[PDB]
Symmetry: C2
Subunit: 101 residues, 2 copies
């Protein structure tokens, strides 16, 4: 039923505070039918690197795919600066149970 | 600000669905001041094992801690399809905690 997509980013240890806020940009994700929620998290107590996750909740995986194929997605997405992002991966999940007070 | 706790379960392949069923019973979590949401997920496209995550969203970490030390938690599962004594095929149960820097709900 409900679907969750995760964009897991590994950053240079300590670079989260200065890098993270950029991921708070929705960039029109809420204009996609089926989009429900978005969370941007920073993992506590990591030592090797800083870990940032962008979680998006959808009514279905089709909704998510439509987002990927949308124009708002296409539109979205100092020189020489070494990037703070070490890895960028995507994971997909079926939400088997959800409850909101 | 907002806080997310995660219980990450590695499971015998094929047991994801049954395991999520054991979590339909929130065991009074919503009675805790600060509790906001719960998500129980199954990781897609895994090969040799299953993965289920129990994510709980809170107003603060203190709220989450209050749940763990609450009477409802300390006093709170078996499925109808279980044989007496059957165990959830858990390979590992790990805990992770997160600060939620941003949240948006349509």
């Amino acid at each position: 039923h409900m679907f969750m997509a995760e964009n897991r980013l590994q950053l240079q240890k300590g670079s989260a505070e200065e890098t993270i806020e950029r991921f708070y940009n929705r960039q029109g994700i809420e204009t996609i039918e089926g989009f429900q929620q978005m969370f941007v998290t920073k993992t506590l107590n990591t030592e090797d690197t800083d870990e940032v996750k962008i979680l998006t909740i959808w009514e279905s995986e089709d909704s998510f795919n439509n987002w990927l194929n949308s124009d708002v997605f296409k539109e979205a997405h100092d020189d020489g600066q070494q990037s703070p992002i070490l890895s960028n991966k995507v994971f997909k999940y079926d939400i088997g149970y959800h409850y909101q007070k």
